[PDB]
Amino acid sequence: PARDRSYAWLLSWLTRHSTRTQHLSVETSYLQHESGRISTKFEFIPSPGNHFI
Amino acid sequence: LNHLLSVAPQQSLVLLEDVDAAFLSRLTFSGLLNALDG
């Protein structure tokens, strides 16, 4: 389930093991530090549906 | 001074102007440099 913390770990492991995943979603890590410093990074995650590995 | 210099925010610069006044003379001359090396 999404409540368990293994969800994100398994999804990251999937997106690493299967580099060429035609179907995927995006997770953006955005953090505006003090003094107006903006840090952004795109983490790509498998899209909802069926995937084969 | 040591507490303020130790708790400075991350990714932030600290500016200490008029450094001559404290060194010439709460106030201290060697205390500030000792605190800096802490």
Rg of chain B (C-alpha set): 11
Distances (CA, A) of A28 to A25, A40, A44, A53, B13: 10, 7, 8, 25, 29
Q: Measured between CB atoms, does B12 come within 8 Å of chain A?
A: yes
Task: Please measure the distance between the N-terminal and C-terminal CA atoms of chain B and give it in whole angstroms.
Answer: 11
Polymer length of chain B: 38
Q: Is B9 on the interface with A (CB under 8 A)?
A: yes
* Resolution (Å units): 3.7
Closest to B13 in 3D by CA, of A37, A21, A43, A9: A37
The number of C-alpha atoms within 13 Å of A9 and in the hemisphere containing its C-beta is 5
Work out the minimum CA distance from B25 to partner chain A, whole angstroms.
34
Q: Which residue of B has its CA nearest to A37?
A: B11
